[PDB]
């Protein structure tokens, strides 16, 4: 499995997902909240 965000250069999944603080792509409270490095986040 591969990184996103700071541990990749910024990019995320092709879907409107969010990048968690350690490079895991997906959706959830710590993915799209104040944890978000990049992607379709709410904050």
From Swiss-Prot:
Name of protein: Agglutinin isolectin 3
Disulphide bridges: 4-19, 13-25, 18-32, 36-41
The scientific name of the source species is: Triticum aestivum
Other notes: The 4 sites proposed for binding to carbohydrates (N-acetyl-D-glucosamine) of receptor molecules are on the surface of the agglutinin molecule.
* Sequence ranges assigned to domain Chitin-binding type-1 in this UniProt record: 1-43
Q: What does this protein do, in the record's words?
A: N-acetyl-D-glucosamine / N-acetyl-D-neuraminic acid binding lectin.
Give the shown range, full length included. 129 to 171 of 186
* Quaternary structure annotation from Swiss-Prot or TrEMBL: Homodimer, u-shaped.
């Amino acid at each position: 499995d591969k990184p996103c965000g700071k541990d990749a250069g910024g990019r995320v999944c092709t879907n409107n997902y969010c990048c968690s603080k350690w490079g895991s792509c997906g959706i959830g409270p710590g993915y799209c909240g104040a944890g978000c490095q990049s992607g379709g986040c709410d904050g």
